[PDB]
Design a protein around this ligand. Structure first.
Ligand code: CLA
Ligand code: CLA
Ligand code: CLA
Ligand code: CLA
Ligand code: CLA
Ligand code: CLA
Ligand SMILES: CCCCCCCCCCCCCCCCCC(=O)OC[C@H](CO[C@@H]1O[C@H](CO)[C@H](O)[C@H](O)[C@H]1O)OC(=O)CCCCCCCCCCCCCCCCC
Ligand SMILES: CCCCCCCCCCCCCCCCCC(=O)OC[C@H](CO[C@@H]1O[C@H](CO)[C@H](O)[C@H](O)[C@H]1O)OC(=O)CCCCCCCCCCCCCCCCC
Ligand SMILES: CCCCCCCCCCCCCCCCCC(=O)O[C@@H](COC(=O)CCCCCCCCCCCCCCC)COP(=O)(O)OC[C@H](O)CO
Ligand SMILES: CC1=C(/C=C/C(C)=C/C=C/C(C)=C\C=C\C=C(C)\C=C\C=C(C)\C=C\C2=C(C)CCCC2(C)C)C(C)(C)CCC1
Ligand code: SF4
Ligand code: SF4
Lengths: 81, 73, 143, 42, 153, 83, 68
C-alpha cells in the first residue's frame, strides 16, 4: 500500500534525487558500481506522495530512479485532513 | 459532395492517426521508453523531461474520441 | 551506534497568533508530526501553514499535520537560518517514531550502515514485459 | 553596422521582409492579372 | 459537355448571374454623381466584373446548373489548365522552396553551433542557394539515383 | 531631500545587444538548443524582476517602457486624426 | 602491461541501448573508467541534448558499437 520507488544500477551517484525529495523517501548508501561509490535507496516509500521530483532531477539517459504509482493512503494522497 | 467527402476523409485519417499513434507508442517511445510497465491508463509521468501530460494510450483514445465525434457530426 | 533523541514534551513552542491551516481531525484519529529545533537567536520565520511565527531562543517544538510540512520547514531552517532539526511522528496512542535522520546523518550524504531497499541490479530497459508476469501478483519492476 | 546587419538577419525581421515582398508581389500580380481561375496560357 | 455541364459561354444562368451583379452595382452607382471618385470606383468594378465573366466564358470552363463554373480534375486535356498545369507549377515552386531549405540545412549542418545559423539566417549563403532550386527536379532525381536523398541512419 | 537624482550615461547605445537574442538573462543568452528557447525568449522579455535583482535598473526599464507605450499611443492617436 | 579497456577517447560510438534517447545516434567517448567494478564506464558526449537537456551519459561495453 505505497508507491513503488525503484533504484537501478545506472545511478551515477549524484544526490539530487535525495535532495529533491519532499518526504524523505530516498537516501544515499555506499556502493562500488560507479565513481561516486554510492547509490540511492528507497526504504521509506510508505511516505512517498508520487510527486516525481526525484526523477525530474536524474541526469542519466533514462531515469535510474523510477516511481510507479500504486495503492494510495492518506499520506500518499497528500491529505492533511 | 466532393468537399464534404474530402473533409470526411480528413476526419477518418486524423482519427486513425491518433489511434494508430497510441497503439504503436503504447509500449513506449523516446520520451517514455517503459510505458508498458505503467499499464494502459495512467495520468502522466510528471513534469520532468519537459512535461508528460496525455502520454498514455488511454489519453490517445480520449483525444481520438473528440475527432470521431467531429467526423460523425 | 547512533541513538535517536527522545522527544521532550515540555519544549516551548514558537510565538504564533493562530491560523486555520493547523491541525484537524486527522491529528486525533490518526498520526501527526512534531518538529523540534534549536534556535540560537529569537527571530521570525514563515510557517508552512500560512502566516509568520516568531521562534524563541533555545529549543522550539512545532506540531504539524503532514510530514511534507515538517520537511519543508526543516529545509527552510537549514538553508536560511542554519538550524539542526529533527521531526517525529506521534500517534493517538502516544507512540513516537523518530523519522527524519534515520542514522543521525542527512540522507543526501553517504553514511555507512544503510541497507539497500528497492535496488534493481539492471538497467531500466531490461524490465520484464507484462505478458510474462500476467496472472501472477508480481509486477515487472518488483522482480 | 555589422551588429545591425546581424539584427536584420534574425528570424522575425528577415521573415517580415521576405513575406512583405512576397505579399506585394502577389498583390501586384492579382491587380495586373485579376480573377484567375484557370491557366489559359497553354 | 462533361458530366452534364454546359460551357460557361453558352450558359443562360451565367449571363443571369452577370445581370444580377451588374444590376446591384448600378443600384449602388445611382447614389452618386458620375464625375465623383466613388462613381469611378464603381464603374471600374463593373468593368472588372464584365471582363471576368467574358474571360470565364472564353476560357472553356464548364458551368453547372447553378450558373457557376465547375473545375474538372479528372485529367481531361480540354481542362488541363484548371488543375494539372497550375498543379505542376505549384509542385515546381514547392520543390524549389523545399530543396533550397534542405540545401541550407545541409550546408550549416557541420558547424560549431548550427542553431545560431537558424535563429539568425546567414544571408549570403541563403542567397547563393536560392537559385539552386531552379534546377531542383534534375538535382533531386540525380540525388535519388546516387542514394544521397535518403539517410540510412 | 526630494531632489532630482539622476546618473549620466549608464547604458551604452549600441546594436550589439540587438544582434544577440535573449541578452537580458543568462539561461537564455547561451543560445537555442531546442525550439522551446524561442518561446522562452518571448516569455521573459518584459520580466525585468527576473533579469536583475537591482530595483534601480528595473525601475529605469519600467520608466522607459512607459515612455515607449506613450509613444505608441500618440502614434495611434495621430493615425486616427489623420484617417 | 594491463592495457586500458574500452574504446579510445574521442572515437565515435553507436549506442545500441533501447531505452536511450540516442539509441541509433553516434557519440564521442570522453572518458572510460578503468575500475573493473564500474558497471557503465564509457562516458559518451552527444551533440544533441535529450529531453532533460543533458548531452552526456555513461554506457557499458556491450551497449557500445564502434563505427568507421
Ligand atoms: C514587393 C514587390 C513589389 C513589386 C514587384 C511591385 C511591382 C510594381 N509596382 Mg507596386 N507596391 C509595392 C510592392 C511591389 N510592387 C508596395 C509595398 C507598395 C506600397 C508602397 C506598392 C505600391 C505601388 C504604387 C503606388 C505603384 C506601384 C506600381 C508598380 C509597378 C511599377 C514599379 C510594378 C509592376 C506602379 C504602377 O501603377 O504600375 C503601373 C505604381 O504607381 N506599386
Ligand atoms: C486550398 C488552397 C487554395 C487554393 C488552391 C486557392 C486557389 C486560388 N485562389 Mg483562393 N483563397 C484561399 C485558399 C486557396 N485558394 C484562402 C484560404 C483564402 C482566404 C485568405 C483565399 C482567398 C482568395 C482571394 C482573395 C483570391 C483567391 C484567388 C485564387 C486563385 C489564384 C490567384 C491568382 O490569381 O494567382 C495568379 C498566379 C500566381 C500568383 C502564380 C505565381 C507564380 C510565381 C510568379 C512564379 C512564376 C514561375 C517562374 C486560385 C483559384 C484569386 C481569385 O480571383 O480567384 C478566382 C483571388 O483574388 N483566393
Ligand atoms: C481514379 C483515379 C484516376 C486517376 C489517378 C486518373 C489519372 C489520369 N487520367 Mg483519368 N479518368 C478517371 C480516373 C482517373 N484518372 C475517370 C473516372 C475519368 C472519367 C471517365 C477519367 C478520364 C480521363 C480523361 C478524359 C483523360 C484522363 C487522363 C488522365 C491522366 C492525366 C492520368 C493518368 C488524360 C490522359 O490520359 O492524357 C494524359 C485524359 O485525357 N482521364
Ligand atoms: C506636474 C508635472 C508632472 C506631470 C504632468 C506628470 C505626468 C505623467 N507622469 Mg509623472 N512624475 C512627476 C511629475 C509629473 N508627472 C514627478 C515630479 C515624478 C517624480 C516623483 C514623477 C514620476 C513618474 C513616474 C516614475 C512615471 C510617471 C509617469 C507619468 C505619465 C503617466 C500618466 C499618463 O501617461 O497620462 C497621459 C498624460 C499626458 C500625455 C499629458 C501631457 C503630459 C506631458 C506630455 C508630460 C510633460 C511632464 C513632465 C513631468 C515635465 C517636462 C520635463 C522637461 C524636462 C521637459 C504622465 C505623462 C509614468 C509614465 O508614463 O512615464 C513615461 C511613469 O512611469 N511619473
Ligand atoms: C507596448 C510596446 C512595447 C514596448 C514599449 C516594449 C519595450 C521594450 N522591449 Mg518589448 N515586446 C513587445 C512590446 C513592447 N516592448 C512585444 C509585443 C513583444 C513580442 C513578445 C516584445 C518582446 C521583446 C523582446 C524579445 C525584447 C524586448 C525588449 C524591449 C526593450 C526595447 C528597447 C529598445 O531598444 O527599443 C528601441 C526601439 C526603436 C528605436 C524602434 C524599434 C523598431 C523595451 C523594454 C528587449 C529587451 O532587452 O528587453 C529587456 C528584447 O530583447 N521586447
Ligand atoms: C494606429 C495605427 C495605424 C493604423 C492601424 C493605420 C491603418 C491604415 N492606414 Mg494609416 N496612418 C497612420 C496610422 C495608422 N494607420 C499614421 C500615423 C499616418 C500618418 C503618416 C497614417 C497615414 C496613412 C496614409 C497616407 C495611408 C494610410 C493607409 C492605411 C491602411 C494601410 C495601408 C498600408 O499601409 O499598407 C502598405 C504597407 C506597407 C508595409 C508599405 C511600406 C510602408 C512602411 C513599411 C511603413 C512605415 C513607414 C513610415 C490602413 C487602413 C492607406 C489608406 O488607407 O489609403 C486608402 C494610405 O494610403 N495611412
Ligand atoms: C534617429 C534614428 C537613428 C538611430 C540609430 C543611430 C544611433 C544608434 C547608435 C549608433 O549609430 O552607434 C554606432 C553603431 C556602431 O558604432 C560603433 O561600431 C563599433 C564597431 O567597430 C563598435 O561597436 C562601437 O562600440 C560602436 O559605437 O553603428 C551601427 O551599428 C548603426 C547601424 C546603422 C543604424 C541605422 C539606423 C536606421 C535604423 C534605426 C532603427
Ligand atoms: C527590400 C529592402 C531591404 C533592405 C536591406 C535588407 C537586406 C536584406 C536583409 C538582411 C540583411 O540586412 O543582412 C545583410 C546581408 C548579409 O548579412 C550577414 O548576415 C550574417 C548572419 O549571421 C551576419 O550577421 C553577417 O555579419 C552579415 O553581414 O547582406 C548581404 O550580403 C545580403 C546578400 C545580398 C542580397 C542577395 C539577394
Ligand atoms: C514508380 C516505381 C518506383 C519503384 C521504386 C522502388 C525501386 C527501389 C528504390 C531504390 C532507390 O530509391 O534507389 C535506387 C535508385 O532509384 C531508382 O532506381 C528508382 C527511381 C524511381 C523514379 C523512376 C521510376 C520510373 C518513372 C517513369 C515515369 C537505387 O539506388 P541504390 O540503393 O543502389 O543506391 C545506393 C547508393 O549509391 C549508395 O551506395
Ligand atoms: C495524374 C493526376 C492525378 C493522380 C495522381 C496520383 C494518383 C498520384 C499518386 C502519386 C503517388 C502515389 C506518389 C508517391 C510518392 C512516393 C514517395 C515515396 C515520395 C517521396 C517524395 C520525396 C522523397 C520528396 C522529396 C523532396 C523533394 C524532391 C523536393 C522538396 C523537398 C523534399 C526533400 C521533401 C489526379 C487524378 C489526382 C489529377 C490529375 C493528375
Ligand atoms: S537515482 Fe538519480 S539522482 Fe540518485 S544517484 Fe542515481 S542518477 Fe543520481
Ligand atoms: S516521488 Fe517525490 S516523495 Fe516519492 S521518492 Fe520521488 S521525490 Fe520523494
Amino acid at each position: 500500500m505505497s508507491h513503488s520507488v525503484k533504484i537501478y544500477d545506472t545511478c551515477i551517484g549524484c544526490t539530487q534525487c535525495v535532495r529533491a525529495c519532499p518526504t524523505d523517501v530516498l537516501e544515499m548508501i555506499p556502493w562500488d558500481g560507479c565513481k561516486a561509490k554510492q547509490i540511492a535507496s528507497a526504504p521509506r516509500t510508505e511516505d512517498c506522495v508520487g510527486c516525481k521530483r526525484c526523477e525530474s532531477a536524474c541526469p542519466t539517459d533514462f531515469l535510474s530512479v523510477r516511481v510507479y504509482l500504486w495503492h494510495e493512503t492518506t499520506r500518499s494522497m497528500g491529505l492533511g485532513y | 459532395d466532393f468537399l464534404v467527402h474530402h473533409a470526411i476523409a480528413l476526419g477518418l485519417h486524423t482519427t486513425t492517426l491518433i489511434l494508430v499513434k497510441g497503439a504503436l507508442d503504447a509500449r513506449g517511445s523516446k520520451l517514455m521508453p517503459d510505458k508498458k510497465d505503467f499499464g494502459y491508463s495512467f495520468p502522466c509521468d510528471g513534469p520532468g523531461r519537459g512535461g508528460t501530460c496525455d502520454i498514455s494510450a488511454w489519453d490517445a483514445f480520449y483525444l481520438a474520441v473528440f475527432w470521431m465525434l467531429n467526423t460523425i457530426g | 551506534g547512533f541513538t535517536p533523541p527522545e522527544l521532550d514534551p515540555n519544549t516551548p513552542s514558537p510565538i504564533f497568533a493562530g491560523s486555520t491551516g493547523g491541525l484537524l481531525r486527522k491529528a486525533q484519529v490518526e498520526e501527526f508530526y512534531v518538529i523540534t529545533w534549536e534556535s540560537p537567536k529569537e527571530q521570525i520565520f514563515e510557517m508552512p501553514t500560512g502566516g509568520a511565527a516568531i521562534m524563541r531562543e533555545g529549543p522550539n517544538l512545532l506540531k504539524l499535520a503532514r510530514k511534507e510540512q515538517c520537511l519543508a520547514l526543516g529545509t527552510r531552517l537549514r538553508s536560511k537560518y542554519k538550524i539542526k532539526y529533527q521531526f517525529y511522528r506521534v500517534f493517538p496512542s502516544g507512540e513516537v517514531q523518530y523519522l527524519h535522520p534515520k542514522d543521525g546523518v542527512y540522507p543526501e550524504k553517504v553514511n555507512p550502515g544503510r541497507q539497500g531497499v528497492g535496488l534493481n541490479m539492471r538497467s531500466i530497459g531490461k524490465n520484464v514485459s507484462p505478458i510474462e508476469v500476467k496472472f501472477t501478483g508480481k509486477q515487472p519492476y518488483d522482480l | 553596422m555589422r551588429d545591425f546587419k546581424t539584427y536584420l538577419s534574425v528570424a522575425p525581421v528577415l521573415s517580415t521582409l521576405w513575406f512583405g515582398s512576397l505579399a506585394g508581389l502577389l498583390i501586384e500580380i492579382n491587380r495586373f492579372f485579376p480573377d484567375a481561375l484557370t491557366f489559359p496560357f497553354f | 459537355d462533361i458530366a452534364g455541364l454546359t460551357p460557361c459561354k453558352e450558359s443562360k444562368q451565367f449571363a443571369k448571374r452577370e445581370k444580377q451583379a451588374l444590376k446591384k452595382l448600378q443600384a449602388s452607382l445611382k447614389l452618386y454623381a458620375d464625375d465623383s471618385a466613388p462613381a469611378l470606383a464603381i464603374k471600374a468594378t463593373m468593368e472588372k466584373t464584365k471582363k471576368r465573366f467574358d474571360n470565364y466564358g472564353k476560357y472553356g470552363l464548364l458551368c453547372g446548373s447553378d450558373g457557376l463554373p465547375h473545375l474538372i480534375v479528372s485529367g481531361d486535356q480540354r481542362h488541363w489548365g484548371e488543375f494539372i498545369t497550375p498543379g505542376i507549377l505549384f509542385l515546381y515552386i514547392a520543390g524549389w522552396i523545399g530543396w533550397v531549405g534542405r540545401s541550407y540545412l545541409i550546408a550549416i549542418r557541420d558547424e560549431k553551433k548550427p542553431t545560431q545559423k537558424e535563429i539568425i539566417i546567414d544571408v549570403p549563403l541563403a542567397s547563393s542557394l536560392l537559385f539552386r532550386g531552379f534546377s531542383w527536379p534534375v538535382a533531386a532525381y540525380r540525388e535519388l539515383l546516387n542514394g544521397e536523398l535518403v539517410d540510412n541512419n | 531631500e526630494v531632489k532630482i537624482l539622476v546618473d549620466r550615461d549608464p547604458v551604452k547605445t549600441s546594436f550589439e545587444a540587438w544582434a544577440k537574442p535573449g541578452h537580458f538573462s543568462r539561461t537564455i543568452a547561451k543560445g537555442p538548443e531546442t525550439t522551446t528557447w524561442i518561446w522562452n525568449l518571448h516569455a521573459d522579455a518584459h520580466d525585468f524582476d527576473s533579469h536583475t535583482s537591482d530595483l534601480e535598473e528595473i525601475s529605469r526599464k519600467i520608466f522607459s517602457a512607459h515612455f515607449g507605450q506613450l509613444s505608441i499611443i500618440f502614434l495611434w492617436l495621430s493615425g486616427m486624426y489623420f484617417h | 602491461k594491463p592495457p586500458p579497456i574500452g574504446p579510445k577517447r574521442g572515437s565515435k560510438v553507436r549506442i545500441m541501448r533501447k531505452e536511450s534517447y540516442w539509441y541509433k545516434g553516434v557519440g564521442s567517448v570522453v572518458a572510460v573508467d578503468q575500475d573493473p567494478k564500474t558497471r557503465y564506464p564509457v562516458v559518451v558526449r552527444f551533440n544533441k541534448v535529450n529531453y532533460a537537456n543533458v548531452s552526456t551519459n555513461n554506457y557499458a561495453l556491450d551497449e557500445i558499437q564502434e563505427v568507421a
